[PDB]
Design an enzyme around this catalytic site. Structure first.
Site, PDB file in Angstrom:
ATOM      1  N   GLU A   1      -3.967   1.914  -2.975  1.00 31.23           N
ATOM      2  CA  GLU A   1      -4.027   3.345  -2.525  1.00 31.23           C
ATOM      3  C   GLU A   1      -2.859   4.070  -3.640  1.00 31.23           C
ATOM      4  OE1 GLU A   1      -4.332   3.680   1.558  1.00 31.23           O
ATOM      5  OE2 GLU A   1      -4.810   5.925   1.639  1.00 31.23           O
TER       6      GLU A   1
ATOM      7  N   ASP B   1      -4.213  -5.079   1.288  1.00 29.84           N
ATOM      8  CA  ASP B   1      -4.150  -4.169   2.444  1.00 29.84           C
ATOM      9  C   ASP B   1      -5.823  -4.706   2.835  1.00 29.84           C
ATOM     10  OD1 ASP B   1      -4.693  -2.607   4.632  1.00 29.84           O
ATOM     11  OD2 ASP B   1      -4.447  -0.741   3.702  1.00 29.84           O
TER      12      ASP B   1
ATOM     13  N   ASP C   1       2.980   4.620   5.129  1.00 33.46           N
ATOM     14  CA  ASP C   1       2.805   4.295   6.274  1.00 33.46           C
ATOM     15  C   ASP C   1       2.866   2.784   6.359  1.00 33.46           C
ATOM     16  OD1 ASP C   1       0.267   4.429   5.025  1.00 33.46           O
ATOM     17  OD2 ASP C   1      -0.837   5.124   6.809  1.00 33.46           O
ATOM     18  N   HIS C   2       2.665   1.809   5.387  1.00 31.67           N
ATOM     19  CA  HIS C   2       2.821   0.651   5.255  1.00 31.67           C
ATOM     20  C   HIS C   2       3.984  -0.037   4.684  1.00 31.67           C
ATOM     21  CE1 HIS C   2      -1.988  -0.203   5.295  1.00 31.67           C
ATOM     22  NE2 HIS C   2      -1.829   1.092   4.948  1.00 31.67           N
TER      23      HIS C   2
ATOM     24  N   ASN D   1       0.901  -1.052   0.061  1.00 34.81           N
ATOM     25  CA  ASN D   1       0.105   0.092  -0.117  1.00 34.81           C
ATOM     26  C   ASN D   1       1.080   1.122   0.009  1.00 34.81           C
ATOM     27  OD1 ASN D   1      -1.425   2.235   0.860  1.00 34.81           O
ATOM     28  ND2 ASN D   1      -2.894   0.853   1.860  1.00 34.81           N
TER      29      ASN D   1
ATOM     30  N   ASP E   1      -1.666  -6.265   6.212  1.00 41.98           N
ATOM     31  CA  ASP E   1      -1.413  -6.347   4.707  1.00 41.98           C
ATOM     32  C   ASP E   1      -1.139  -7.988   4.636  1.00 41.98           C
ATOM     33  OD1 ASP E   1      -1.339  -3.543   3.321  1.00 41.98           O
ATOM     34  OD2 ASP E   1      -0.188  -3.407   5.127  1.00 41.98           O
TER      35      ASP E   1
ATOM     36  N   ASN F   1      -7.085  -4.481   6.137  1.00 40.40           N
ATOM     37  CA  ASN F   1      -7.589  -3.623   7.041  1.00 40.40           C
ATOM     38  C   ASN F   1      -8.284  -4.315   7.960  1.00 40.40           C
ATOM     39  OD1 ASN F   1      -7.103  -0.871   6.674  1.00 40.40           O
ATOM     40  ND2 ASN F   1      -8.020  -0.854   4.842  1.00 40.40           N
TER      41      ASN F   1
END
Length: 268
Positions: free
Chosen positions: A34, A151, A258-259, A7, A229, A153
């Protein structure tokens, strides 16, 4: 055949991380989530220069997925058949050829959900999982090679939660998404179809490896994150998984998503 899921949280803002993944991992397939770029603005030439075929769809500043492959796929599409426009900006499915069979690859950017009580985002997340489950049950067989990455989530078990006990309980108490009982139900139903969480299977007792770390709280420094993930593989593929990982080194780069990228290598 090596797969990397990442991501990127803004593809045009982070070409440096994508190049790093290619240099370091030399992967056969890369699934991005994303990307946040409009199709007309996608870096087609740049990706071609990296040596990859690419299928993608997104919109300016929101959602977006792309599937980069070294080999040409037999078939590729956005969204599952019958999916609406939004779902098409969150899912890419492909049939990748191998000498003795085809591997079905699904790259998804699953709705975060926000909170159990959000009148729109939580139902959207439930429905997204329901659509995936229905596709699996009506079109595929657990005996076929299938790889679902992205991802999700959702943190499948408590070993995937590193934000701390007090925070974990507060999130549950306030209904914040990621590891709610309802969410775990959807994930369990998905696994029960016949999928193996590659990283978890290879690392059955690891409770200190995560894929997402919040920016504001500087979670990456303290290793306070969530493993959301994943790379889920069906039986025949899972049996061949020789390596799995979460790349903390790439997450350590300047201006990073951030991933952290996650990967799985399959070789017989």
């Amino acid at each position: 055949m090596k797969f990397v899921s990442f991501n990127i949280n803004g593809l045009r803002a982070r070409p440096h991380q994508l190049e790093a993944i290619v240099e370091k991992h030399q992967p056969d397939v890369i699934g991005l989530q994303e990307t946040k770029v409009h199709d007309d603005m996608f870096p087609l030439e740049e990706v071609a220069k990296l040596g990859y075929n690419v299928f993608y769809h997104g919109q300016k500043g929101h959602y977006g997925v792309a599937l980069l492959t070294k080999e040409t796929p037999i078939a590729v599409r956005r969204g599952f058949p019958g999916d609406d426009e939004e779902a098409q900006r969150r899912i890419i499915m492909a049939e990748i050829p191998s000498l003795l069979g085809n591997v079905t690859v699904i790259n998804g950017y699953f709705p975060q959900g926000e909170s159990r009580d959000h009148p729109i985002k939580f139902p959207a997340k439930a429905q997204f999982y329901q659509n995936l489950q229905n596709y699996l049950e009506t079109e595929l067989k657990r005996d076929n090679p299938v790889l679902i990455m992205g991802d999700m989530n959702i943190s499948p078990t408590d070993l995937d939660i590193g934000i701390g006990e007090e925070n974990r309980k507060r999130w549950l108490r306030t209904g914040k998404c990621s590891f709610l009982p309802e969410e775990r139900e959807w994930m369990d139903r998905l696994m029960s179809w016949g999928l193996v969480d590659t990283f978890r299977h290879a690392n059955p007792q690891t409770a200190d490896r995560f894929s997402w770390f919040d920016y504001r709280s500087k979670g990456f420094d303290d290793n306070r994150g969530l493993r959301i993930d994943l790379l889920l593989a069906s039986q025949p593929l899972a049996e061949c998984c020789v390596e799995t990982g979460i790349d903390y080194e790439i997450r350590s780069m300047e201006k990073p998503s951030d991933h952290a990228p996650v990967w799985a290598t399959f070789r017989r």
